[PDB]
């Protein structure tokens with residue numbers, strides 16, 4: 055009855071191919087497997103553990119609320135949800151906040167709301183949604199159809215219709231497809247899964263102007279780039295472009311399943327300042343928000359980015375593997391040179407062997423999404439491990 | 452118009468212990484609603500609090516780049532206790548249903564034909580509020596107004612086997628059914644209907660999908676309602692009681708069906724995280740015991756005897772139905788459309804209850820609700836009824 059890696063194949067649907075070792079415990083940016091091997095975590099559970107593992111403040115919030123009240127249905131509100139709603143409203147453009155569990159659910163509510171607002175405020179025929187190639191918005195049938203990767207939306211029967219995809223950063227293409235029958239433009243300000251590609255300023259500003267012209271809602275999916283990831287509370291604040299609806303998840307709860315959809319009173323009235331929210335989830339997300347939304351933590355994200363980028367540059371000087379280093383704050387993408395095209399997974403595996411956890415963003419890009427408070431010592435140790443992994447792969451060349 | 456139920460500003464739950472809840476003013480309520488059949492072991496159950504806190508000190512989240520011990524331990528328990536051979540964990544019943552419906556579609560696509568896409572579902576069904584799940588749900592008012600719905604979904608009346616036979620064909624990929632429709636008036640499938648679905652799915656090579664989000668995890672007095680009926684589905688979904696108040700869900704199926712998915716066919720950031728799975732494991736360990744499952748039947752009769760006594764005094768119910776601790780009490784025609792008013796009257800009297808449409812009262816208390824709480828809460832509900840009538 056020992057639980058091993060082999061156990062996964064006997065138990066879970068074959069939709070994942072997980073690592074050969076099993077993390078069992080973590081503190082900060084260090085993680086231990088069943089053999090007590092120690093890893094440096096630059097993956098963050100895919101940009102989720104924004105304050106690292108078992109952060110004392112988050113554990114305290116969990117325990118305190120866990121002794122008090124876990125659950126209310128959406129018939130009720132609860133103090134943690136009201137508190138978190140207020141902090142989001144005070145800190146952002148939002149006047150109304152709806153809480154869910156996952157990024158997928160938050161996006162379902164955002165896309166349903168944009169559709170419904172158009173239906174009741176303009177016309178039942180105003181249904182087109184513009185989205186972008188390589189976008190990722192979740193795995194429900196609707197959200198994966200708004201997602202821009204046909205490989206993930208093919209094969210589930212008839213897709214919800216009236217979704218049009220154009221290239222990310224192509225403002226002319228958006229202009230071309232938008233019209234009075236368009237209800238929404240949905241965009242990630244930085245495409246995380248899609249190779250860590252940031253919107254240009256002109257593109258994002260252009261989406262706002264086109265949404266205004268056509269009476270469409272601009273929906274920012276900040277599930278991955280939000281909650282401090284870029285070094286601002288939300289990426290829209292870096293750009294100075296205010297969306298009509300914004301979604302947040304991943305870092306919002308520091309690891310606890312929680313998500314949010316933020317909008318205005320005018321738009322939300324198509325459906326008090328908050329709706330939903332698990333008491334336990336919202337208590338934890340409140341503690342997370344209180345730490346991430348501080349000048350010091352947000353400044354540190356930029357300091358830490360440069361510490362990572364200097365190491366990636368040193369690695370490239372030595373080994374000649376990267377064509378581009380991009381992203382914002384502590385979402386970092388390092389694109390492999392053509393010689394190593396398609397081999398991101400080879401470097402991820404060698405990384406894991408060397409004791410560092412990193413991500414891909416497609417087969418050509420390495421992705422780093424560490425805790426926003428990752429200690430400098432852990433940045434240097436993990437990046438030395440990564441350099442060692444790169445060395446081992448390159449020596450085979 | 453269908454009116455929702457919302458609490459006013461003067462009713463904000465702040466604390467729960469067992470089957471008792473207190474609001475901001477310190478008013479105490481007996482909880483016969485369970486947050487809509489979620490807190491199946493009541494509020495802040497010591498074993499669940501212990502699981503939460505101990506795993507909370509250890510590991511919360513690693514993503515599905517990794518597997519984790521609590522998830523594999525919970526999957527093993529679900530596999531051992533049910534027809535399932537493989538599982539996927541998600542964060543809500545809606546997400547588990549999305550996974551099930553996508554799996555049934557994809558299985559048909561790759562095993563039979565990309566054209567085998569019809570899904571048969573039932574009027575008054577509830578499967579969640581995502582665009583796909585609400586379109587499979589059987590309340591048009593809830594699926595209207597969001598632009599183009601995912602196609603190839605056909606609705607017929609619950610419990611009408613003939614109608615299912617009439618619409619099913621070789622182009623049908625699935626029949627999706629709640630063994631008891633919870634939101635839809637607490638209506639249980641008849642034995643003939645449920646077995647009929649299994650036979651029709653076999654005939655047409657379609658997958659039978661049971662949504663046990665509300666009726667599963669002990670709610671009926673068996674671990675899953677399918678066990679009461681002795682009809683085994685191809686895919687089953689579970690949530691709510693599974694995590695006792697922690698957001699977690701599961702989709703259960705066989706290896707043969709699971710194998711239609713490949714790496715990257717579906718996924719979830721949070722789904723299967725060790726904190727959720729540690730909590731659901733603790734919940735499962737308590738609910739899946741002979742003693743708790745027996746007690747659910749004892750407790751059902753305690754509630755039903757109270758409901759009958761209320762009816763003898765006030766003449767308000769035409770029918771008392773459901774299974775285990777999912778209880779429906781249909782209002783007589785004289786009280787048609789009054790379920791919300793009885794619910795609000797209950798709250799004033801210090802008891803939290805549910806509706807199941809405008810004509811039906813619903814009860815979904817903790818599976819371990821104390822006999823003393825059943826009697827006190829039902830006395831409060833009788834008082835509320837006296838205020839209404």
Ligand SMILES: Cc1ncc(COP(=O)(O)O)c(/C=N/OCC[C@H](N)C(=O)O)c1O
Pocket residue numbers: 100155156157158159161190191192193242246247275276277278279303304515717718719720721
């Ligand atoms: C921009 C953006 N929007 C929405 C989502 C969906 O969030 P989720 O439902 O919480 O997984 C995501 C989630 N990405 O997660 C990685 C992929 C996931 N593991 C999968 O395979 O589904 C995202 O990056």
Ligand SMILES: Cc1ncc(COP(=O)(O)O)c(/C=N/OCC[C@H](N)C(=O)O)c1O
Pocket residue numbers: 127128129487543544545546548577578579580629633634662663664665690691
């Ligand atoms: C048979 C059945 N299937 C799926 C669900 C949805 O599960 P959830 O996403 O875990 O709430 C449910 C949930 N019912 O809860 C009530 C409604 C809730 N407030 C909502 O409107 O989504 C169910 O009864």
Ligand SMILES: O=[N+]([O-])c1cc([N+](=O)[O-])c(O)c([N+](=O)[O-])c1
Pocket residue numbers: 078079081086087089090091092
């Ligand atoms: O701090 N710790 O909780 C901790 C835990 C483990 N472990 O194996 O789970 C270690 O190996 C170490 N360690 O190696 O320092 C530390």
